[PDB]
Amino acid sequence: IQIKHSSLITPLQAVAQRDPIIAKQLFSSLFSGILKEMDKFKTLSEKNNITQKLLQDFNRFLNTTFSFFPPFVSCIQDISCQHAALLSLDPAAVSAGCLASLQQPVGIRLLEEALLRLLPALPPDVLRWVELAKLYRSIGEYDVLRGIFTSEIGTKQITQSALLAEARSDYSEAAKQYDEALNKQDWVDGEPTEAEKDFWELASLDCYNHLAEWKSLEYCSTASIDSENPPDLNKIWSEPFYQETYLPYMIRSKLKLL
Amino acid sequence: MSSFEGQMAEYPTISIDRFDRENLRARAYFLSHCHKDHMKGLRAPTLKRRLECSLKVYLYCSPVTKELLLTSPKYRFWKKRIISIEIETPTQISLVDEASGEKEEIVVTLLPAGHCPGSVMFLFQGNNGTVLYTGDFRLAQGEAARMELLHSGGRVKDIQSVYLDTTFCDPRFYQIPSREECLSGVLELVRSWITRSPYHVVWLNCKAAYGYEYLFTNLSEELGVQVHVNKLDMFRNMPEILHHLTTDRNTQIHACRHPKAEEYFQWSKLPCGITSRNRIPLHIISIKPSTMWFGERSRKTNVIVRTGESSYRACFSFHSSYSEIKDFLSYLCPVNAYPNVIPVGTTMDKVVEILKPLCRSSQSTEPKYKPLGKLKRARTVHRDSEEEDDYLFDDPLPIPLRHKVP
Amino acid sequence: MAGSGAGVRCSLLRLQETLSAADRCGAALAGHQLIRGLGQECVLSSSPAVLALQTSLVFSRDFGLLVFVRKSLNSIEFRECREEILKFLC
Amino acid sequence: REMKPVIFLDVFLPRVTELALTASDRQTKVAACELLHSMVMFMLGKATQMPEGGQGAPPMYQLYKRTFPVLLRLACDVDQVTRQLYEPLV
Ligand SMILES: [Mg+2]
Ligand SMILES: [Mg+2]
Ligand SMILES: [Zn+2]
Numbered sequence: 001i002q003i004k005h006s007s008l009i010t011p012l013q014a015v016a017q018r019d020p021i022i023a024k025q026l027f028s029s030l031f032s033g034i035l036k037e038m039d040k041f042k043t044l045s046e047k048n049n050i051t052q053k054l055l056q057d058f059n060r061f062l063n064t065t066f067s068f069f070p071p072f073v074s075c076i077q078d079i080s081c082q083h084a085a086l087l088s089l090d091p092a093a094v095s096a097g098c099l100a101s102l103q104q105p106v107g108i109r110l111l112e113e114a115l116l117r118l119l120p121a122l123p124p125d126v127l128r129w130v131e132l133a134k135l136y137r138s139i140g141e142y143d144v145l146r147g148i149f150t151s152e153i154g155t156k157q158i159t160q161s162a163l164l165a166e167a168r169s170d171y172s173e174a175a176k177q178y179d180e181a182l183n184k185q186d187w188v189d190g191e192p193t194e195a196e197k198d199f200w201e202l203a204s205l206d207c208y209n210h211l212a213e214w215k216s217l218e219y220c221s222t223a224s225i226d227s228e229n230p231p232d233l234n235k236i237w238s239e240p241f242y243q244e245t246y247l248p249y250m251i252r253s254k255l256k257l258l
Numbered sequence: 259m260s261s262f263e264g265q266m267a268e269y270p271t272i273s274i275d276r277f278d279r280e281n282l283r284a285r286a287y288f289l290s291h292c293h294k295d296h297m298k299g300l301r302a303p304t305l306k307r308r309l310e311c312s313l314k315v316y317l318y319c320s321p322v323t324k325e326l327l328l329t330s331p332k333y334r335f336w337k338k339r340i341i342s343i344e345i346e347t348p349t350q351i352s353l354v355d356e357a358s359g360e361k362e363e364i365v366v367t368l369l370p371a372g373h374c375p376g377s378v379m380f381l382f383q384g385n386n387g388t389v390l391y392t393g394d395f396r397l398a399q400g401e402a403a404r405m406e407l408l409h410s411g412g413r414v415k416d417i418q419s420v421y422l423d424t425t426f427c428d429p430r431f432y433q434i435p436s437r438e439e440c441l442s443g444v445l446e447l448v449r450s451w452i453t454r455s456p457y458h459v460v461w462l463n464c465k466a467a468y469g470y471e472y473l474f475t476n477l478s479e480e481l482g483v484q485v486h487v488n489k490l491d492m493f494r495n496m497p498e499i500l501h502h503l504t505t506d507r508n509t510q511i512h513a514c515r516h517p518k519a520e521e522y523f524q525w526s527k528l529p530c531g532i533t534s535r536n537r538i539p540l541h542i543i544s545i546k547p548s549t550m551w552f553g554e555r556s557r558k559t560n561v562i563v564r565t566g567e568s569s570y571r572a573c574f575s576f577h578s579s580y581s582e583i584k585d586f587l588s589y590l591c592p593v594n595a596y597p598n599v600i601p602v603g604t605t606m607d608k609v610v611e612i613l614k615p616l617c618r619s620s621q622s623t624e625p626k627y628k629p630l631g632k633l634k635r636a637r638t639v640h641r642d643s644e645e646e647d648d649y650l651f652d653d654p655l656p657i658p659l660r661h662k663v664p
Numbered sequence: 665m666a667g668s669g670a671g672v673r674c675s676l677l678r679l680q681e682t683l684s685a686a687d688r689c690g691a692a693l694a695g696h697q698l699i700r701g702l703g704q705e706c707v708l709s710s711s712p713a714v715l716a717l718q719t720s721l722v723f724s725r726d727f728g729l730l731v732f733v734r735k736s737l738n739s740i741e742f743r744e745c746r747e748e749i750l751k752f753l754c
Numbered sequence: 755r756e757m758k759p760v761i762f763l764d765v766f767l768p769r770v771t772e773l774a775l776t777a778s779d780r781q782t783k784v785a786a787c788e789l790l791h792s793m794v795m796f797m798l799g800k801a802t803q804m805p806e807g808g809q810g811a812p813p814m815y816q817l818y819k820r821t822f823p824v825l826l827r828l829a830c831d832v833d834q835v836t837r838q839l840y841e842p843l844v
Contacts, residue, residue: 001799003792011789012766018782021769026761033759041757172655179658197662204658216658223660258633263697279744280693607708 024071031079051085058086062093068100077106087114091124091131104135111135122194129153130195153199156181156192162200166207175207205249218253221246260295262393262598268386268419269364271353275393277305285353288366289319290393291377292326292468301332309339314354316341320368322496323376326468329492343368345378346407367407371395373576374469375499381407387418390590393598394423396578398436402589417592424597425577427612428604430553434579435561440572441473443562444545445480447570452483452510457538461528462513463546469576470513470547471499477511478502486512486530507532547574550602587616672721675702680727683736692741699745703752729753763793764817771824774836787828787836791843794821 016023038047058076065073077094080086091111098107111132115125129152136144146163154160162177178200181192192200201224208217222231225242236242236250264276265284273281274288277299281287290296299305309315319327321342327333328340343349345368353362362384369379373394380391390408402408408415426434448460462485464470474485475498484504493500507530516522516529523544527533534540552559552573561573578586587595595613600606665674679698685691706718722729729749736742766789774790777783801814829840 001795001802003795008789008792008796011785011792014785015770015773015782015789018779018785019769019773022766022773025765025769029761029765030759033761034757037757037759175655175658179656183659183661201660201662208658211655213655216655220658220660224662224664227663263700280697283690283693606704607710610708 020069020071024075028075028079028082032082035083048085051083055086055088059090059093062090062097065097068097070101070103073097073101074103074106077103077110081106081110081113084117087117088124089114091128095131095135098135099138104139108132108135126153126193126195130198133199149199149203153195155196156189158184159196159200162203166203171207171210175204175211175213178204178207202245205246209249209252212256214253214256217249218257221250221253259599260298260393261600262421266382266389266391266419266421268389269382269384271362272364272382274380274391274421277302282308285315285355285362286351287315287317288380288391289317289323289327290380290391291320291371291374292323293374293394293466296393306335309335312356314352314356315339318343318351318366320345320376320378323378325495326376326492345370348383348407369405369407372397374466375471375496376468388415389419389421390417390592391421392423392586393421394425394577396576397582397586399582399585402586408590414590417590419594419596420587420590420592421596421598422583422587422613423577423599424583424609424613425599425601426549426553426575426579427583427597427609428580428601430603431549431575431579433581434549434552434575435573437472437574437576440547440561440574441476444473444547444572444574445477447545447562448477448511449481451543452481455541456510457535458541458543459510459512459528461523461542461544462511463519463544464513464515465548466576470574473547473574474511474513475499475502481511483511484509486514488514508535541568543568543570545570545572547572549573549575549577584616587613591616591618593618670717670721671705672702672718673727675705676721676724676727676729676732679732683732683739683742687739687741689741692745695742695745696748699748699752703748706752763796767793767817767821771821774828775824783833784835787839790824790828791839794825794843797821 012026016026038050042050058080061076062073077089077097080089087110089110091114094107094110098104111128115128115132119125129148133145133148133153136142136148146167150160150163154163158177158181162174162181165171165177166174182197182200182204201220205217205220208220222233225235225246226232233250236247260275262274262276264273264278264281266272266274271285272288273284275290275296277284277287279299281299282304289300317336317340319340319342321344324340324342328337343366348365348367351364351366353364354360364382364384367381367383369381371377371379371392371394373396377394379393379395382389382391451460452458462470462473474487478484479502484502486505486507486509487503490500490503490505493503507528512528512530514529519529522529523542525533526540526542528540528542546569548571551571563571565571595617597606597609597613600609665677667674667677675698679695679702682691682695682698685694702722706722709715709718725731729752733746733749736746770786770790770793773782773786777786797814797817801811804811825840825844828836829844831837831840
C-alpha cells in the first residue's frame with residue numbers, strides 16, 4: 001500500500017484523457033474541491049469576485065456552443081448545482097442546452113436548486129419556473145406541469161378552472177375557458193402576467209390539438225406571428241421561440257387538413 | 259496491344275505511344291519503349307512529310323530507347339529530332355506552336371518501368387494538374403511506396419489522372435511470380451540439361467523483341483555460355499548486354515527467332531540453319547517464356563511446366579499482375595484512371611468497374627431537393643353538403659379569437 | 665458544348681458544326697475523333713433507358729449520323745469519317 | 755503547493771471497473787487497469803488507517819463486494835499484462 005502520489009495521479013489523468021465520463025467526474029470533483037478550499041484562504045470580496053467571474057464564464061460557455069456535448073453541459077450544470085453562488089445561471093441558456101443535449105434531468109435539478117436556495121435571495125423566479133415547466137413538458141411529466149401552472153404560474157381563478165377541466169379530459173370546456181381568459185379585458189384585481197398568457201395560448205393549442213380541431217389549431221398557431229390578417233408563414237423561421245412553440249402545431253394542422 | 263489513342267485528356271497537345279490519325283497536329287511526341295504496339299504511325303509517310311516541314315517538334319524518350327530506335331534503318335530519319343531525357347530528372351518541355359508564336363511550358367519526369375530496355379514512365383506537371391502515364395510497366399507489391407519522384411514530403415503527390423497498363427487486369431492473373439523465380443527455374447533446367455554433353459542445346463522461344471535481356475544476361479553470367487541472337491548491333495553502346503550475346507551458331511543456349519521456327523524445332527533444328535555440329539545430332543529442348551498460357555490453367559500449376567518430351571513453358575511476365583495493379587492504383591489513389599489496353603477475355607466495362615473503386619472518388623452528395631408545388635387536386639372533392647339534425651349532438655365549439663400582434 | 669450531361673448529344677453537335685470549319689483536314693481529324701468517341705461511348709452502354717436515349721439521339725433528323733453523311737458526301741476530305749460512321753452503324 | 759482539495763475516488767470506481775473489464779482501446783484498458791490497481795491499494799490503505807479520534811476505520815464492505823469480482827475476472831483475463839498484474843494482486 002506504500003504507493004506514491006504519482007502512481008495514483010498519472011493513471012487518473014491518463015484515463016481522463018480517453019474517457020469523457022471520467023474526465024467529467026474528475027473535473028467536477030477538482031472544481032468543487034478547489035472552490036471549497038478557497039473559503040479558508042481568501043476574503044469575502046475576493047470569493048464574490050471569483051464566483052461572479054465563474055458565473056460569467058459558465059454563461060459564456062452555455063451561450064456560445066453548437067455541438068452541445070452531453071458530458072460538458074452536464075458537468076457545467078452539475079458544478080453549478082453544488083455551489084449556491086453559481087445557481088444564478090441564465091435559465092434560458094440552461095434549458096436550451098438541456099433540450100439540445102437531452103439532459104433535461106440535470107437542468108431540472110439546477111432549476112429546482114435555484115428555486116430552493118435563492119428563494120430568500122419578469123421576475124427571475126417566474127422565468128426559472130417557466131423554464132422548469134418547459135423542461136418537464138419535454139419529458140412528458142404533465143402532472144408536475146399542471147401542478148407548477150396551478151401553484152406558481154397561474155394567479156387567476158379562470159386558470160384554475162380551465163386546468164381542472166383539462167385534468168378530466170374535458171378539453172372543450174378548457175379551451176372555452178382559455179379563450180375567455182385570452183379575450184378578457186375587464187380584470188378587476190389586475191392584469192395577468194406575460195407567462196400566464198403564454199401558458200394560456202399553449203394550453204389552448206394543446207386543447208385544440210386533442211379535440212382534433214384542425215382549423216382552430218392552424219388559426220391559433222399563426223394568429224400571433226405576424227401583424228397582417230393573412231399571416232406570413234415564413235415569420236416562423238424568425239424566432240427560435242416560434243420555431244419551438246408554433247411550428248409543430250401548425251405543420252400538424254396543415255397536414256391533417258391536406 | 260495498346261488501346262491508348264496517344265492523347266491525354268488534360269494535355270491534348272502531346273501524344274504518347276501513338277502517332278496515327280489526330281497526333282499529326284501534336285506539339286511534342288513521347289515514346290515509352292520500343293515495342294511495336296506502342297509505335298503505330300511512327301514511320302508514317304504523313305509524319306515523314308511533317309517532320310521535314312517543321313523545326314520545333316521533337317520526340318522525347320529514354321536514351322536506351324533512342325539507341326534501340328536509331329539502330330533500325332526505317333527509323334533513322336528521327337536522328338535529328340529525338341531528344342533523350344535522363345530518368346528521375348525533371349525537365350521543362352516547350353510546347354511551342356509552329357504556325358503561331360504561342361508557347362506553353364510543361365514539366366515531365368521519366369520514371370523506370372522495369373519492362374524492357376528503355377521502358378520508362380511519363381509524369382507531366384502543368385496547368386491542368388499532375389498526370390501519370392505508366393505504359394507497360396511492372397511493379398511488385400510494396401514498390402509503389404519506394405518511388406522518390408512520386409512522393410512530395412513523405413506523401414503521395416496529388417495525381418489527377420493515371421493512364422496505367424491493364425494488360426493483366428483481371429482475376430485470372432491473380433499473382434504472377436516474380437521474374438527472379440522464373441529465372442532460377444529456367445537456370446536450373448538449362449544447367450541440368452546442358453551439363454550432360456556439349457551437344458545439348460536449349461532454345462528460348464521469345465516472342466517479344468525486347469524484354470528478355472534479363473534472362474539472357476543472367477543465364478550467361480551463371481553458365482558462362484553466350485546466347486545466340488539474330489542481331490546484336492543494337493546493343494553496341496551497351497557493354498553489359500553486348501558481351502552476353504553472340505552471332506555464332508556454335509553455342510549451346512540459343513534465342514534466335516523465325517516465323518516458321520516451330521516446324522524447324524519439330525524437325526530437331528534451331529531457327530538458325532544449323533542442325534548439327536561435326537555431323538553429330540543435337541538434342542534440343544524448347545523453353546517458351548509467356549504468361550497468357552498460365553492464365554488459362556484450371557488447377558495448381560508450377561513456374562516451370564513440361565508440355566512435352568522436349569518442350570517447357572516458363573511464367574515470365576514483364577507486366578504487372580492484377581494484385582500488383584490493384585496495389586499500385588490504391589497506393590497512388592488518383593482522381594481518375596484510364597486503362598491503356600483491354601485484356602483479351604475481359605471487356606472495357608469490367609476493367610472500368612474494377613479500376614473505379616480504387617480511384618479517389620470518395621465524394622458523395624445527397625440528391626437534389628425535388629420541389630412539390632401546385633398540388634394535384636384543385637377543387638375540394640371531399641366537401642360535404644352540411645345537412646344535420648343538430649339536436650342529437652352537443653353545441654358546436656365557437657371559433658377562437660386571437661388579438662395578439664407581435 | 666454545354667450539353668455535357670449526355671455526351672452523345674454534344675458530340676453530335678460538335679460533329680455537325682465540324683462540317684462548317686472550311687472543310688479542312690484538321691476538322692476531318694477532329695470529326696473522326698469525335699465519331700470514335702461517341703461510338704465507343706454508345707457501345708459500352710448497357711442500361712435500356714439510356715440505350716434508347718442514345719439510339720434516338722444518334723438517329724435524329726437534325727444532328728444525326730445519317731443527315732451528317734448525307735451532307736458530307738460531297739466532301740472527299742471526310743472519307744474516313746463516313747467509313748467510321750458506317751462501321752459504328754453496323 | 756498551497757492547497758489540498760479533497761477528491762472522492764469512489765465516484766470513479768464503477769466506470770473504472772467497467773473500462774478495465776470491457777475497454778476496446780488497449781491504451782485505455784491498460785490505463786484503467788493501472789488506475790484500478792492504485793485505487794485498490796488506496797482502499798486497503800484507507801481501511802487500515804486508524805483515525806486517532808473517536809471514529810473508527812471506514813467500512814469498505816460495500817466497495818469490496820463489487821470490487822472483488824472485477825479483480826477476480828481481471829486476474830484470469832486473456833490479456834497477458836492484465837493477468838500478470840492482477841494475479842499477484844489477488
Ligand atoms: Mg507494347
Ligand atoms: Mg510492353
Ligand atoms: Zn540460334
